[PDB]
Amino acid sequence: PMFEAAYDFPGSGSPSELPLKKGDVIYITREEPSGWSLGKLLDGSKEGWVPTAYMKPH
């Protein structure tokens, strides 16, 4: 399903993370027991880890 970022997430921890601005709608495919979710931009141009807690239903 699709989810929208509720908070900015610069994603500076690693290159495997997906930077988001508040307002960005993305696909989420998996939510992990680490507290991280795997997201993908709607145009398929990038994917990466985002904090599950930042993402609200869209």
Side-chain angles (χ1 to χ4, degrees), residues 22-34:
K22 181 179 175 53
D24 295 356
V25 175
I26 64 176
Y27 287 106
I28 292 177
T29 49
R30 310 283 158 117
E31 300 180 351
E32 308 287 353
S34 62

mmCIF file with all atom_site columns, all heavy atoms in Angstrom, residues 22-34:
data_model
loop_
_atom_site.group_PDB
_atom_site.id
_atom_site.type_symbol
_atom_site.label_atom_id
_atom_site.label_alt_id
_atom_site.label_comp_id
_atom_site.label_asym_id
_atom_site.label_entity_id
_atom_site.label_seq_id
_atom_site.pdbx_PDB_ins_code
_atom_site.Cartn_x
_atom_site.Cartn_y
_atom_site.Cartn_z
_atom_site.occupancy
_atom_site.B_iso_or_equiv
_atom_site.pdbx_formal_charge
_atom_site.auth_seq_id
_atom_site.auth_comp_id
_atom_site.auth_asym_id
_atom_site.auth_atom_id
_atom_site.pdbx_PDB_model_num
ATOM 1   N N   . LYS A 1 22 ? 8.481  15.522  4.448  1.00 0.00 ? 22 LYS A N   1
ATOM 2   C CA  . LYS A 1 22 ? 7.082  15.481  4.850  1.00 0.00 ? 22 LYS A CA  1
ATOM 3   C C   . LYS A 1 22 ? 6.223  15.776  3.627  1.00 0.00 ? 22 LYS A C   1
ATOM 4   O O   . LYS A 1 22 ? 6.471  16.747  2.914  1.00 0.00 ? 22 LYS A O   1
ATOM 5   C CB  . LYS A 1 22 ? 6.784  16.505  5.945  1.00 0.00 ? 22 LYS A CB  1
ATOM 6   C CG  . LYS A 1 22 ? 5.330  16.494  6.436  1.00 0.00 ? 22 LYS A CG  1
ATOM 7   C CD  . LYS A 1 22 ? 5.096  17.528  7.541  1.00 0.00 ? 22 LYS A CD  1
ATOM 8   C CE  . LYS A 1 22 ? 3.618  17.597  7.949  1.00 0.00 ? 22 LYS A CE  1
ATOM 9   N NZ  . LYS A 1 22 ? 3.082  16.250  8.301  1.00 0.00 ? 22 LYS A NZ  1
ATOM 10  N N   . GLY A 1 23 ? 5.225  14.926  3.398  1.00 0.00 ? 23 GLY A N   1
ATOM 11  C CA  . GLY A 1 23 ? 4.348  15.041  2.248  1.00 0.00 ? 23 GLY A CA  1
ATOM 12  C C   . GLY A 1 23 ? 4.633  14.036  1.141  1.00 0.00 ? 23 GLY A C   1
ATOM 13  O O   . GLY A 1 23 ? 3.836  13.880  0.209  1.00 0.00 ? 23 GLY A O   1
ATOM 14  N N   . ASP A 1 24 ? 5.780  13.361  1.194  1.00 0.00 ? 24 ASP A N   1
ATOM 15  C CA  . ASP A 1 24 ? 6.098  12.406  0.140  1.00 0.00 ? 24 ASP A CA  1
ATOM 16  C C   . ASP A 1 24 ? 5.305  11.116  0.309  1.00 0.00 ? 24 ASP A C   1
ATOM 17  O O   . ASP A 1 24 ? 5.401  10.458  1.340  1.00 0.00 ? 24 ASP A O   1
ATOM 18  C CB  . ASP A 1 24 ? 7.584  12.102  0.104  1.00 0.00 ? 24 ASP A CB  1
ATOM 19  C CG  . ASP A 1 24 ? 8.410  13.296  -0.277 1.00 0.00 ? 24 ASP A CG  1
ATOM 20  O OD1 . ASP A 1 24 ? 7.836  14.370  -0.597 1.00 0.00 ? 24 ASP A OD1 1
ATOM 21  O OD2 . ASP A 1 24 ? 9.654  13.244  -0.283 1.00 0.00 ? 24 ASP A OD2 1
ATOM 22  N N   . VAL A 1 25 ? 4.524  10.760  -0.710 1.00 0.00 ? 25 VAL A N   1
ATOM 23  C CA  . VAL A 1 25 ? 3.792  9.491   -0.767 1.00 0.00 ? 25 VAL A CA  1
ATOM 24  C C   . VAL A 1 25 ? 4.683  8.458   -1.479 1.00 0.00 ? 25 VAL A C   1
ATOM 25  O O   . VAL A 1 25 ? 5.223  8.740   -2.559 1.00 0.00 ? 25 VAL A O   1
ATOM 26  C CB  . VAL A 1 25 ? 2.450  9.637   -1.523 1.00 0.00 ? 25 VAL A CB  1
ATOM 27  C CG1 . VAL A 1 25 ? 1.751  8.289   -1.691 1.00 0.00 ? 25 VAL A CG1 1
ATOM 28  C CG2 . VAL A 1 25 ? 1.516  10.637  -0.818 1.00 0.00 ? 25 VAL A CG2 1
ATOM 29  N N   . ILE A 1 26 ? 4.843  7.286   -0.856 1.00 0.00 ? 26 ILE A N   1
ATOM 30  C CA  . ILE A 1 26 ? 5.657  6.181   -1.384 1.00 0.00 ? 26 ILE A CA  1
ATOM 31  C C   . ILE A 1 26 ? 4.924  4.855   -1.197 1.00 0.00 ? 26 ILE A C   1
ATOM 32  O O   . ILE A 1 26 ? 3.944  4.795   -0.469 1.00 0.00 ? 26 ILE A O   1
ATOM 33  C CB  . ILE A 1 26 ? 7.013  6.092   -0.651 1.00 0.00 ? 26 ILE A CB  1
ATOM 34  C CG1 . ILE A 1 26 ? 6.811  5.746   0.838  1.00 0.00 ? 26 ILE A CG1 1
ATOM 35  C CG2 . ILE A 1 26 ? 7.810  7.397   -0.811 1.00 0.00 ? 26 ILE A CG2 1
ATOM 36  C CD1 . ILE A 1 26 ? 8.104  5.537   1.640  1.00 0.00 ? 26 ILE A CD1 1
ATOM 37  N N   . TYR A 1 27 ? 5.406  3.802   -1.846 1.00 0.00 ? 27 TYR A N   1
ATOM 38  C CA  . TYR A 1 27 ? 4.939  2.434   -1.577 1.00 0.00 ? 27 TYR A CA  1
ATOM 39  C C   . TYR A 1 27 ? 5.747  1.859   -0.419 1.00 0.00 ? 27 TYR A C   1
ATOM 40  O O   . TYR A 1 27 ? 6.938  2.130   -0.309 1.00 0.00 ? 27 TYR A O   1
ATOM 41  C CB  . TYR A 1 27 ? 5.102  1.528   -2.801 1.00 0.00 ? 27 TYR A CB  1
ATOM 42  C CG  . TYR A 1 27 ? 4.122  1.805   -3.902 1.00 0.00 ? 27 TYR A CG  1
ATOM 43  C CD1 . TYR A 1 27 ? 4.512  2.456   -5.066 1.00 0.00 ? 27 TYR A CD1 1
ATOM 44  C CD2 . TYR A 1 27 ? 2.795  1.404   -3.787 1.00 0.00 ? 27 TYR A CD2 1
ATOM 45  C CE1 . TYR A 1 27 ? 3.596  2.704   -6.091 1.00 0.00 ? 27 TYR A CE1 1
ATOM 46  C CE2 . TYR A 1 27 ? 1.873  1.645   -4.812 1.00 0.00 ? 27 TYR A CE2 1
ATOM 47  C CZ  . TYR A 1 27 ? 2.285  2.298   -5.960 1.00 0.00 ? 27 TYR A CZ  1
ATOM 48  O OH  . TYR A 1 27 ? 1.382  2.549   -6.974 1.00 0.00 ? 27 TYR A OH  1
ATOM 49  N N   . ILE A 1 28 ? 5.090  1.119   0.473  1.00 0.00 ? 28 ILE A N   1
ATOM 50  C CA  . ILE A 1 28 ? 5.786  0.308   1.473  1.00 0.00 ? 28 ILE A CA  1
ATOM 51  C C   . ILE A 1 28 ? 5.418  -1.150  1.259  1.00 0.00 ? 28 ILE A C   1
ATOM 52  O O   . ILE A 1 28 ? 4.237  -1.500  1.189  1.00 0.00 ? 28 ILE A O   1
ATOM 53  C CB  . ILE A 1 28 ? 5.482  0.759   2.922  1.00 0.00 ? 28 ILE A CB  1
ATOM 54  C CG1 . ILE A 1 28 ? 6.108  2.134   3.163  1.00 0.00 ? 28 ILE A CG1 1
ATOM 55  C CG2 . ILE A 1 28 ? 6.052  -0.256  3.933  1.00 0.00 ? 28 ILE A CG2 1
ATOM 56  C CD1 . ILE A 1 28 ? 5.818  2.708   4.505  1.00 0.00 ? 28 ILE A CD1 1
ATOM 57  N N   . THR A 1 29 ? 6.453  -1.978  1.144  1.00 0.00 ? 29 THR A N   1
ATOM 58  C CA  . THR A 1 29 ? 6.324  -3.397  0.829  1.00 0.00 ? 29 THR A CA  1
ATOM 59  C C   . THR A 1 29 ? 6.535  -4.301  2.045  1.00 0.00 ? 29 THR A C   1
ATOM 60  O O   . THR A 1 29 ? 5.960  -5.378  2.094  1.00 0.00 ? 29 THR A O   1
ATOM 61  C CB  . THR A 1 29 ? 7.342  -3.793  -0.264 1.00 0.00 ? 29 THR A CB  1
ATOM 62  O OG1 . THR A 1 29 ? 8.653  -3.307  0.088  1.00 0.00 ? 29 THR A OG1 1
ATOM 63  C CG2 . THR A 1 29 ? 7.024  -3.099  -1.585 1.00 0.00 ? 29 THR A CG2 1
ATOM 64  N N   . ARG A 1 30 ? 7.382  -3.884  2.995  1.00 0.00 ? 30 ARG A N   1
ATOM 65  C CA  . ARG A 1 30 ? 7.676  -4.687  4.203  1.00 0.00 ? 30 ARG A CA  1
ATOM 66  C C   . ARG A 1 30 ? 7.932  -3.793  5.414  1.00 0.00 ? 30 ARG A C   1
ATOM 67  O O   . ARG A 1 30 ? 8.594  -2.772  5.291  1.00 0.00 ? 30 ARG A O   1
ATOM 68  C CB  . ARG A 1 30 ? 8.928  -5.568  4.005  1.00 0.00 ? 30 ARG A CB  1
ATOM 69  C CG  . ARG A 1 30 ? 8.989  -6.415  2.736  1.00 0.00 ? 30 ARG A CG  1
ATOM 70  C CD  . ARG A 1 30 ? 8.128  -7.684  2.746  1.00 0.00 ? 30 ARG A CD  1
ATOM 71  N NE  . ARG A 1 30 ? 7.825  -8.153  1.379  1.00 0.00 ? 30 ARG A NE  1
ATOM 72  C CZ  . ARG A 1 30 ? 8.201  -9.320  0.843  1.00 0.00 ? 30 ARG A CZ  1
ATOM 73  N NH1 . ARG A 1 30 ? 8.908  -10.213 1.533  1.00 0.00 ? 30 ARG A NH1 1
ATOM 74  N NH2 . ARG A 1 30 ? 7.850  -9.609  -0.411 1.00 0.00 ? 30 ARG A NH2 1
ATOM 75  N N   . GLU A 1 31 ? 7.426  -4.183  6.584  1.00 0.00 ? 31 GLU A N   1
ATOM 76  C CA  . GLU A 1 31 ? 7.765  -3.512  7.843  1.00 0.00 ? 31 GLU A CA  1
ATOM 77  C C   . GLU A 1 31 ? 8.455  -4.543  8.734  1.00 0.00 ? 31 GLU A C   1
ATOM 78  O O   . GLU A 1 31 ? 7.928  -5.630  8.945  1.00 0.00 ? 31 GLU A O   1
ATOM 79  C CB  . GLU A 1 31 ? 6.509  -2.913  8.527  1.00 0.00 ? 31 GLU A CB  1
ATOM 80  C CG  . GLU A 1 31 ? 5.794  -1.881  7.657  1.00 0.00 ? 31 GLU A CG  1
ATOM 81  C CD  . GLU A 1 31 ? 4.547  -1.255  8.267  1.00 0.00 ? 31 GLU A CD  1
ATOM 82  O OE1 . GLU A 1 31 ? 4.098  -1.714  9.318  1.00 0.00 ? 31 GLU A OE1 1
ATOM 83  O OE2 . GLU A 1 31 ? 4.015  -0.296  7.651  1.00 0.00 ? 31 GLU A OE2 1
ATOM 84  N N   . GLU A 1 32 ? 9.635  -4.191  9.246  1.00 0.00 ? 32 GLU A N   1
ATOM 85  C CA  . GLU A 1 32 ? 10.533 -5.139  9.917  1.00 0.00 ? 32 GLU A CA  1
ATOM 86  C C   . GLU A 1 32 ? 10.547 -4.927  11.424 1.00 0.00 ? 32 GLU A C   1
ATOM 87  O O   . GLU A 1 32 ? 10.282 -3.816  11.892 1.00 0.00 ? 32 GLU A O   1
ATOM 88  C CB  . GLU A 1 32 ? 11.968 -4.979  9.386  1.00 0.00 ? 32 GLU A CB  1
ATOM 89  C CG  . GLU A 1 32 ? 12.114 -5.030  7.875  1.00 0.00 ? 32 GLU A CG  1
ATOM 90  C CD  . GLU A 1 32 ? 11.944 -6.419  7.288  1.00 0.00 ? 32 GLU A CD  1
ATOM 91  O OE1 . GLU A 1 32 ? 11.839 -7.420  8.041  1.00 0.00 ? 32 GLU A OE1 1
ATOM 92  O OE2 . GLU A 1 32 ? 11.925 -6.506  6.045  1.00 0.00 ? 32 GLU A OE2 1
ATOM 93  N N   . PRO A 1 33 ? 10.889 -5.974  12.189 1.00 0.00 ? 33 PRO A N   1
ATOM 94  C CA  . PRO A 1 33 ? 11.016 -5.853  13.651 1.00 0.00 ? 33 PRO A CA  1
ATOM 95  C C   . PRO A 1 33 ? 12.150 -4.946  14.123 1.00 0.00 ? 33 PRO A C   1
ATOM 96  O O   . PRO A 1 33 ? 12.261 -4.706  15.315 1.00 0.00 ? 33 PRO A O   1
ATOM 97  C CB  . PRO A 1 33 ? 11.246 -7.300  14.113 1.00 0.00 ? 33 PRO A CB  1
ATOM 98  C CG  . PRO A 1 33 ? 11.715 -8.029  12.924 1.00 0.00 ? 33 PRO A CG  1
ATOM 99  C CD  . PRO A 1 33 ? 11.142 -7.352  11.729 1.00 0.00 ? 33 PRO A CD  1
ATOM 100 N N   . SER A 1 34 ? 12.973 -4.460  13.201 1.00 0.00 ? 34 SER A N   1
ATOM 101 C CA  . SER A 1 34 ? 14.003 -3.472  13.509 1.00 0.00 ? 34 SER A CA  1
ATOM 102 C C   . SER A 1 34 ? 13.448 -2.051  13.693 1.00 0.00 ? 34 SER A C   1
ATOM 103 O O   . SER A 1 34 ? 14.152 -1.174  14.200 1.00 0.00 ? 34 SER A O   1
ATOM 104 C CB  . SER A 1 34 ? 15.053 -3.468  12.397 1.00 0.00 ? 34 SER A CB  1
ATOM 105 O OG  . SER A 1 34 ? 14.479 -3.103  11.157 1.00 0.00 ? 34 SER A OG  1
#
